[PDB]
Design a protein that fits this description.
The structure holds two protein chains of two kinds. By secondary structure, chain A is an all-beta fold. Helices cover 0% and strands 50% of the residues of chain A. Chain A contains no helices and one strand. The longest helix of chain B is centred in the last third of the chain and has 9 residues, at 70-78. Classes of the chains: A mainly beta, B alpha+beta. Chain A binds chain B through residues 1-6, and chain B through 17-24, 37-38, 40, 70-71, 74-75, 77-78. Chain A: Homotetramer. Interacts with PDZK1. May interact with CCPG1. Interacts with FES/FPS, ABL1, PIK3R1 and GRB2. Interacts with HCK. Interacts with SH2D5. Interacts with DLG4.
Chain lengths: 6, 93
């Protein structure tokens, strides 16, 4: 439930 | 629920994608979906204009990433070749 960046 | 609109876009990586995603689960789900949280400016998807915040991901670069962790999902997504095939779904509540 995290928010990464690709 | 009434059958969403899933589509795969074929774009090329100019200098990254620049976006955000979040993993969400539920009931009767033995996997994890890479949903979209936001889109960074000057990104391959932002400049071209295809995917938006609050969406769902299924396949990336022709890979079935159904049941992977955000780390493996995002990492693999950025770890693509010149051509990229992101399959995003159209929905929203």
């Amino acid at each position: 439930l995290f928010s990464t960046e690709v | 629920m009434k059958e969403p609109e899933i589509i795969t876009v074929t774009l090329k990586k100019q200098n990254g994608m620049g976006l955000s995603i979040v993993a969400a689960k539920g009931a009767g789900q033995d996997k994890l979906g890479i949903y979209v949280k936001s889109v960074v400016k000057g990104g391959a998807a932002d400049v071209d204009g295809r995917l938006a915040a609050g969406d769902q991901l299924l396949s990336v670069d022709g890979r079935s990433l159904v049941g992977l962790s955000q780390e493996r999902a995002a990492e693999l997504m950025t770890r693509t070749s010149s051509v990229v095939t992101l399959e995003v779904a159209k929905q929203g509540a």
